[PDB]
């Protein structure tokens, strides 16, 4: 059994990771500032002898004793990371430096929640871990894209110079229960529009592509990577790729909705395609996703139908 | 007349910029930690009523009153920026945040000394300001390359969110008097090897290319950009491109040396070509370089011949 810190642990992915590690008998500390997450996502563990929740911003120094750190603290939705670009940049840079400083002092292993956005608007397909990416350093999404790229650089600098044990996950689009209704990402927007009979809002023509993974698959991958001997980056995603118009049509069908599909302005600097190569995770970890897309989407639709009731 | 701060002002470029602004009658403050620069580069101004030198690391907070900030603090030579990757990353991230915080508080205009390295190992030619670059986020040079890319992102975040007036220069390879003998960049290495009859050490085959600019041209460009109304990035460089083997042959000829040219291992992740497009600087600033390559190299050779005497 281990002492484990999860930054961003009151968010969407972090709350599901908290559940797995608590069930396995570890001592878990969650750090969050509730910028985009909420106490409600982890409230079922409050009071348990092996759990603590701390209201703390990772840009401020933190001194505790742990064996492992899962570093997930950052806004993740484009409308929420572009809300305040200075906050986004400070979280990814100063926040990551503070957590590597902690790992160095106490001898902890640190895992970074990086992103497929490090690949930018890709010029190879699929995207494997050897691709360097195509990213605008001064566009409206750069506060996030460049913040995450430099966070990876920081991890490898501390490994080489100070002997810190590091792990890096490049996470592809993941969805599931506990996402906020006003999060603004595509799966939550389309499900809620369809449920209410409002127009599904496609940004641009809808020919751009993404590949979506259910949250339980991501959580199993994160724990496998943390406890492996692999320090170089590993893609964690589902290789099944579709267009955004196809995704709108599928959601409309699974919900059983009469919503119109409408076409609005394109998003500025929007990546036009995305598909992970997961050969490395398969061969080095023995990991692959096991939840089919329709099964996962049905679990998410159930969550949001309940939420609209928790409102009405 | 203005109150002006120059971070990195005791280094190679910064010391020449200090000279220009002092001659023009401004009040100049230099901040430096002497990691790669030295007091000797600005010692001629010490005691002047309009000059102050402060021993200060930009990662530590700084509270002074100025009208303009030229932000040049970072190691610049690949052997010196790869010496300690953690120091390089902290300087470019935390240092830039502290200087933007200062500009916000006092209402100063800030100029960033960015780099052609933001373009990486390029896949277009020449390189104009609209190119996004091809950069390895986790290779041995990334501590510098990614540090500089995210520093640009930070400047535009403060302009948009807080109304800070910003200027961004993308600087291409620049050489001249005052470079350290053990700096490790190619112009200083080749000149000193040739002067001493030692082998000129070409890294790889020598087919890789660069375009070199004399320091006085860079300084005139930096002042023109600072005092313009152009906030988007501007390339400052000399468009004359040659191979590294051609440069070795030219230096050997200008020095009059019998040195052998030897071929050693390639540098890891070394950019294979580089040539600036300077149409934007020409049309928006009325600026172009005016010092020919041979004239500039002869000025640099004179400096190093004197230095080897200051040793012997
Ligand atoms: N879900 C995905 O498809 C996806 C894709 C790529 C990367 N990621 C990464 O995984 C992580 C989790 O993403 P998510 O989808 O759960 O989003 P989320 O917004 O639900 O979770 C992020 C959490 O971090 C917290 N946080 C933000 N800034 C903080 C700060 N300065 N100090 C302390 N806490 C802070 C938020 O309050 C929130 O609880 C993020 O780092 C994200 O960039 C997720
Ligand atoms: N000369 C070039 O070809 C070139 C090319 C691209 C970019 N640049 C940029 O221009 C700037 C000047 O480069 P240079 O060639 O004069 O190199 P340099 O090494 O001579 O100058 C850098 C100066 O910054 C100082 N410094 C470093 N870290 C510091 C810190 N944390 N706090 C305070 N001072 C610190 C050094 O001591 C030095 O005096 C750098 O930012 C460099 O990245 C130069
Ligand atoms: O237990 C710790 C140790 C350090 N830090 C922060 O991590 C940063 C980076 O640590 P590092 O060891 O690199 O810095 P140093 O001690 O040399 O200043 C420091 O500035 C601290 O603010 C932290 O938050 N918790
Ligand atoms: O209401 C929406 C929300 C998003 N998108 C598009 O769906 C894709 C995925 O967007 P998301 O914000 O979920 O993720 P990311 O862009 O970070 O991959 C992008 O092409 C968006 O422009 C859309 O068409 N309508
Ligand atoms: O005159 C100043 C003002 C601020 N700072 C530093 O700049 C950083 C960023 O400033 P900002 O205004 O963004 O931060 P805030 O005041 O909101 O913390 C601060 O944390 C300070 O340490 C500085 O060095 N000199
Ligand atoms: O002794 C040396 C020093 C550098 N170079 C090469 O010259 C080019 C320019 O190197 P420098 O360090 O001056 O600048 P940068 O790589 O930052 O442009 C690169 O291809 C280097 O590998 C070389 O052949 N011999």
Curated annotation (Swiss-Prot), chains A, B:
One of its GO terms (molecular function) is UDP-glucuronate decarboxylase activity. The keyword Acetylation applies. Its cofactor is NAD(+). Its main location: Golgi. The keyword Phosphoprotein applies. It catalyses: UDP-alpha-D-glucuronate + H(+) = UDP-alpha-D-xylose + CO2. GO terms for cellular component: catalytic complex; cytoplasm; extracellular exosome; Golgi cisterna membrane; Golgi membrane. It is a single-pass type II membrane protein. Changing residue 144 to F: Abolished UDP-glucuronic acid decarboxylase activity. Residues 1-312 are lumenal. Pathway: Nucleotide-sugar biosynthesis; UDP-alpha-D-xylose biosynthesis; UDP-alpha-D-xylose from UDP-alpha-D-glucuronate: step 1/1. Signal peptide: none annotated. The active site is at 144 (proton acceptor). Its EC number is 4.1.1.35. UDP-alpha-D-glucuronate binds at residues 62-63, 90, 98, 101, 104-105, 158, 161-162. It is found in: Golgi apparatus, Golgi stack membrane. It comes from the Eukaryota. Changing residue 117 to A: Reduced UDP-glucuronic acid decarboxylase activity. The modification Phosphothreonine is found at residue 7. Keywords: Acetylation, Decarboxylase, Glycoprotein, Golgi apparatus, Lyase, Membrane, NAD, Phosphoprotein, Signal-anchor, Transmembrane, Transmembrane helix. Belongs to the NAD(P)-dependent epimerase/dehydratase family. UDP-glucuronic acid decarboxylase subfamily. Catalyzes the NAD-dependent decarboxylation of UDP-glucuronic acid to UDP-xylose. Necessary for the biosynthesis of the core tetrasaccharide in glycosaminoglycan biosynthesis. Homodimer and homotetramer. Interacts with AKT1. This is UDP-glucuronic acid decarboxylase 1. It comes from Homo sapiens. The gene is UXS1.
């Amino acid at each position: 059994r281990k002492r484990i810190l999860i930054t961003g642990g009151a968010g969407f992915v972090g709350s599901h990771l908290t559940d797995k590690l608590m069930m396995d008998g570890h001592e878990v500390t969650v750090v969050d500032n509730f910028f985009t997450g909420r106490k409600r996502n982890v409230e079922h563990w409050i009071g348990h002898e092996n759990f603590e929740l701390i209201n703390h911003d990772v840009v401020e120094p933190l001194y505790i004793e742990v064996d492992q750190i899962y570093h997930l603290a950052s806004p993740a939705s484009p409308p929420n990371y572009m809300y305040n670009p200075i906050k986004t940049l400070k979280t990814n840079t100063i926040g990551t430096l503070n957590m590597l400083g902690l790992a160095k002092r106490v001898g902890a292993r640190l895992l970074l929640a990086s992103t497929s956005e490090v690949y930018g608007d890709p010029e190879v397909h699929p995207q494997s871990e050897d691709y360097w990416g195509h990213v605008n350093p001064i566009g409206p999404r750069a506060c996030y894209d460049e913040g995450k790229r430099v966070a990876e650089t920081m991890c490898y600098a501390y490994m080489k110079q100070e002997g810190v044990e590091v792990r890096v996950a490049r996470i592809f689009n993941t969805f599931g229960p506990r996402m906020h209704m006003n999060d603004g990402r595509v799966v939550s927007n389309f499900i809620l529009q369809a449920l209410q009979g409002e127009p599904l809002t496609v940004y641009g023509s809808g020919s751009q592509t993404r590949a979506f993974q259910y949250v339980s698959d991501l959580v199993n991958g994160l724990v496998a990577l943390m406890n492996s001997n692999v320090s170089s980056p590993v893609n964690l995603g589902n290789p099944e790729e579709h267009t955004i118009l196809e995704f709108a049509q599928l959601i409309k069908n699974l919900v059983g909705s009469g919503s119109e599909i409408q076409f609005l302005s394109e998003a500025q600097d929007d990546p036009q395609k995305r598909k992970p190569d997961i050969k490395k995770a398969k061969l080095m970890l023995g990991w692959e996703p096991v939840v089919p897309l329709e099964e996962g989407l049905n679990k998410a639709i159930h969550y949001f139908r309940k939420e609209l009731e928790y409102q009405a």
